[PDB]
Design an enzyme around this catalytic site. Structure first.
Site, PDB file in Angstrom:
ATOM      1  N   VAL A 177       1.244  -0.966  -0.290  1.00 46.99           N
ATOM      2  CA  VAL A 177      -0.205  -0.181  -0.081  1.00 46.99           C
ATOM      3  C   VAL A 177       0.819   1.039  -0.491  1.00 46.99           C
ATOM      4  O   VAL A 177       2.361   1.359   0.609  1.00 46.99           O
ATOM      5  CB  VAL A 177      -0.948  -0.140   1.224  1.00 46.99           C
ATOM      6  CG1 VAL A 177      -1.937   0.713   1.001  1.00 46.99           C
ATOM      7  CG2 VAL A 177      -1.559  -1.168   1.490  1.00 46.99           C
ATOM      8  N   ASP A 189     -15.078  -8.429   9.697  1.00 49.66           N
ATOM      9  CA  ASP A 189     -14.201  -7.971   9.842  1.00 49.66           C
ATOM     10  C   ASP A 189     -13.653  -6.215  10.290  1.00 49.66           C
ATOM     11  O   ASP A 189     -12.711  -6.380  10.603  1.00 49.66           O
ATOM     12  CB  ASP A 189     -12.737  -8.353   8.638  1.00 49.66           C
ATOM     13  CG  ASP A 189     -11.494  -8.667   9.183  1.00 49.66           C
ATOM     14  OD1 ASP A 189     -10.668  -9.431  10.603  1.00 49.66           O
ATOM     15  OD2 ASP A 189     -10.318  -8.447   8.304  1.00 49.66           O
ATOM     16  N   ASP A 216     -11.435  -2.037   3.880  1.00 47.82           N
ATOM     17  CA  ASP A 216     -11.574  -3.330   3.876  1.00 47.82           C
ATOM     18  C   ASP A 216     -12.558  -4.073   4.055  1.00 47.82           C
ATOM     19  O   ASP A 216     -12.946  -5.270   5.319  1.00 47.82           O
ATOM     20  CB  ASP A 216     -10.493  -4.261   5.917  1.00 47.82           C
ATOM     21  CG  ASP A 216     -10.466  -5.562   5.388  1.00 47.82           C
ATOM     22  OD1 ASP A 216      -8.963  -5.705   5.180  1.00 47.82           O
ATOM     23  OD2 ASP A 216     -11.121  -6.378   6.213  1.00 47.82           O
ATOM     24  N   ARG A 232      -7.857  -2.390  13.705  1.00 50.17           N
ATOM     25  CA  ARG A 232      -6.523  -2.186  12.340  1.00 50.17           C
ATOM     26  C   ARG A 232      -7.894  -1.953  10.765  1.00 50.17           C
ATOM     27  O   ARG A 232      -6.973  -1.893  10.246  1.00 50.17           O
ATOM     28  CB  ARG A 232      -6.197  -3.165  12.718  1.00 50.17           C
ATOM     29  CG  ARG A 232      -6.892  -4.891  11.858  1.00 50.17           C
ATOM     30  CD  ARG A 232      -6.159  -5.975  12.314  1.00 50.17           C
ATOM     31  NE  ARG A 232      -7.178  -6.955  11.604  1.00 50.17           N
ATOM     32  CZ  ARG A 232      -8.232  -7.658  12.161  1.00 50.17           C
ATOM     33  NH1 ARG A 232      -8.367  -7.185  13.348  1.00 50.17           N
ATOM     34  NH2 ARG A 232      -8.624  -8.248  11.005  1.00 50.17           N
TER      35      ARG A 232
END
Length: 283
Positions: free
Chosen positions: A42, A153, A171, A157
């Site tokens: 990334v 999820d 995500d 984070r």
């Protein structure tokens, strides 16, 4: 307008082209590595955008010589993310799928993951700033929920933060795989019943992660000890300075009967009252 599980598409790629605008690689600048993902580095960088004014972008690369079963899976994130349009959900600028190095181009979030960001600014944000970050995340998850999308999820984070501390869900992927147990609801771990109700259990851990400034949920307890612990009715305590009303919302998120947990609609209300006044977050 509701989420279209891409996996009903047969040809996986046809989903990308419907949901994710293809971009020109010569309009994309990479400046900096800022992380690594499953599929490759990334980077931070720039896109334009005829319109005008170079837009700052995060760029997830698929490392060269990928397998067919990584270009499908890697680009599955674009197909999902590009169906969403909300201030508290990370924005897709578009993708690069053929003729050039494969990329997902995402809005630049200056402050990175919320868990790494809060560890670096340990003790710098008031309760009313922290309540606000979670109000944002909850607003995101209410929209994702109303769209019929289940995240599976949700963790600090996987929340990104910009330089105005606006927190955004990131995500996209929809304990099978990477979904780690200490963020997952008991009925999701044991029975793979993934729902918005189980995302709310995960939102409850994000609340704890936020109010603790990026402490690891359950510290060093093994996955098995966390599962027995939760099975016995152990729930995490109020982090330092975390009002009892916030911790109480955490405990409701962590009800073992999934229907007793608040919906994201109610969570946003309970958080708005708390911004507007102590709440009182103790009373």
């Amino acid at each position: 307008k509701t989420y279209i599980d891409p996996e009903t598409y047969e040809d996986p790629n046809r989903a990308v082209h419907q949901f994710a605008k293809e971009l020109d690689a010569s309009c994309i600048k990479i400046e900096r590595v800022i992380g690594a993902g499953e599929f490759g580095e990334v980077c931070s960088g720039r896109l334009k955008l005829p319109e005008k004014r170079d837009v700052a972008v995060a760029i997830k690369t698929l490392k060269v010589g990928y397998t067919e079963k990584q270009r499908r899976d890697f680009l599955c994130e674009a197909s999902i993310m590009g169906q969403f349009d909300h201030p508290n959900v990370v924005h897709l600028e578009g993708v690069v799928t053929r003729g050039k190095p494969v990329m997902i181009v995402i809005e630049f979030m200056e402050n990175g993951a919320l868990d790494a960001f809060l560890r670096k600014h340990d003790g710098q944000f008031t309760v009313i700033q922290l309540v606000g970050m979670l109000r944002g995340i909850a607003a995101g998850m209410r929209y994702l929920a109303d769209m019929g999308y289940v995240h599976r999820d949700l963790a600090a984070r996987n929340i990104l933060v910009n330089s105005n501390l606006v927190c955004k869900v990131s995500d996209f992927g929809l304990t099978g795989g990477k979904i780690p147990v200490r963020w997952t609801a008991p009925e999701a771990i044991q029975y793979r019943k993934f729902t918005s109700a189980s995302d709310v259990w995960s939102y409850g851990i994000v609340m704890w992660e936020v109010m603790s400034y990026g402490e690891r949920p359950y510290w060093d307890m093994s996955n098995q000890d966390v599962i027995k612990a939760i099975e016995e009715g152990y729930r995490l305590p109020a982090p330092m300075d975390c009002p009892a009303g916030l911790h109480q919302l955490m405990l409701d998120c962590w009800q073992k009967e999934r229907a007793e947990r608040p919906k994201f609609e109610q969570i946003v209300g309970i958080l708005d009252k708390m911004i507007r006044n102590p709440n009182s977050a103790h009373h």
